[PDB]
């Protein structure tokens, strides 16, 4: 419940 989705811009 504590994990956020990663953001990964090129």
């Amino acid at each position, epitope marked *: 419940v*504590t994990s956020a989705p990663d953001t990964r811009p090129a």
Partner: antibody
Amino acid sequence: VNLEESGGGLVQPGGSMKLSCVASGFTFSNYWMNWVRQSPEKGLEWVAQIRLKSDNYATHYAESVKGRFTISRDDSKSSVYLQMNNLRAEDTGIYYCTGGVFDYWGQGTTLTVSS
Amino acid sequence: DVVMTQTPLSLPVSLGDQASISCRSSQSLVHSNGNTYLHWYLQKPGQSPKLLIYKVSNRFSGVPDRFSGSGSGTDFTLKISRVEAEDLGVYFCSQSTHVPPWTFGGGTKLEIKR
């Protein structure tokens, strides 16, 4: 939920050590697993992360341990491991196994690096 | 690296009164998805930390209803209402928004005024 750690104790500088953690009570295979260490000097410090099968077992490491520590998991044993090489005095502290960031915590094992 | 700062170092509260613990971040913890990944933990004496509140305000499993979390951006507060003696320990905050690394506050000790 229970996470039980093993390994640790006194290691000489430059030496190696493997911590282990066995978990029960949650769906281990769908949680990122982590090691977190606790020391008077640094407080709580996240050390290493291992992700899922789906993620091809992707990993992240703290700057202070990159290249010396290896995190791994065994979904068949509900276990996570921390292999540590070239240990330094600064690696001393209480190491916790965790599921999530940070849903579930183990009871901790202690590592001391000294001659 | 997000710096998490916790105040006060120690908090004195009478049983049954309300305690408020503060957590500050060096940067806003709002994530692109609009959620805020700020969590609270309690480390009772001689135990490991345990998750209390996740995403600012959600009570975790087994967490009594006197724990509530609030805040936004860089400024967060845990409130413990109707404080019981079993609530004493060190309260930590952590952030999962800007990672790696996942980072922690330095902890606040709840002291019961008896």
